[PDB]
């Protein structure tokens, strides 16, 4: 009942499909999420991975995929919604 976007930059080495759609597998109770991971080289965006992610309170009830981490090496977000990893943005924690 939950579907995400798939991406693997190491598509050739791992002999996996580069990009596409992924049907998730969870449980009757288990909430499912979509993850997205990328790089930011002072503006330029380099993709890393995208796909299914398991029940995590860090992703609970978050409609949008937003990286809350400030100035990290590998930017990451997760969200709870069908294809919500379609796009991502960065916005640090207010604090």
């Amino acid at each position, epitope marked *: *009942t*939950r*579907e995400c*976007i798939y991406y693997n930059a190491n598509w050739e080495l791992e002999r996996t499909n*580069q*990009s*596409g759609l992924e049907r998730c597998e969870g449980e009757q109770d288990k909430r499912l999420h979509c993850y997205a991971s*990328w790089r930011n080289s002072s503006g330029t*965006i*380099e*993709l890393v991975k995208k796909g299914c992610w398991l029940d995590d309170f860090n992703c609970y009830d978050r409609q949008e995929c937003v990286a809350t981490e400030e100035n990290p090496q590998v930017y990451f977000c997760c969200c709870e*919604g*069908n*294809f*919500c990893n*379609e*796009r*991502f*943005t960065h916005l640090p924690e207010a604090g």
Partner: antibody
Amino acid sequence: QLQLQESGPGLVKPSETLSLTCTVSGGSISSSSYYWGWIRQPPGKGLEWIGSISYSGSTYYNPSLKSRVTISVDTSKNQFSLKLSSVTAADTAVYYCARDSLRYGMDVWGQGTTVTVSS
Amino acid sequence: DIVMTQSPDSLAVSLGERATINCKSSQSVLYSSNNKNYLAWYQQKPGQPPKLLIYWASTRESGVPDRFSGSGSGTDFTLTISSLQAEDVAVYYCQQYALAPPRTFGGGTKVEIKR
């Protein structure tokens, strides 16, 4: 704030080929979306989906125009182009580029370019 | 190729009164996601591109007033303007963003004011 801008000739000779390009500000083509599409609207007529593409180059076209339509993707300059061969007077229309999203619809649109096919 | 059909072609309604436009699809656009109703409604004024009004056939996009309400399910849907206002004079379209992709648009319904 996502902004889309089309670029290309407003005039095209008949039987030739039409080329337009959508440039993206606010976000990249890899982030900010998956599919990016092209739409066209003839004068005083309804909207017609041309095609759409992804940041990998996964191309999907309208059945009526699969013959001549060609979408490109340039991850470097935040662009995606449209090329339509063997133009006719029926291809005189306003062309728009839009963010084709799975959830939601056509989120953001460009202001469109009026392309006239004439000698 | 999920064919879309809109009705009527034009509307003339006095300001304050309600407006109603219908959109019928040649295949039910529901999906096992339960979000179902993969339909969108857009408002286009003369010089401008279409402005997204409603997605999921029910939910609104930010900034769109309460006077606009989407409805329906399966194959039949409706867009309803509870109280037509002067700034609402436009041509409204419906579109299916169903996964299987002949991405089809409706005909368009021009709303007008009786003044």
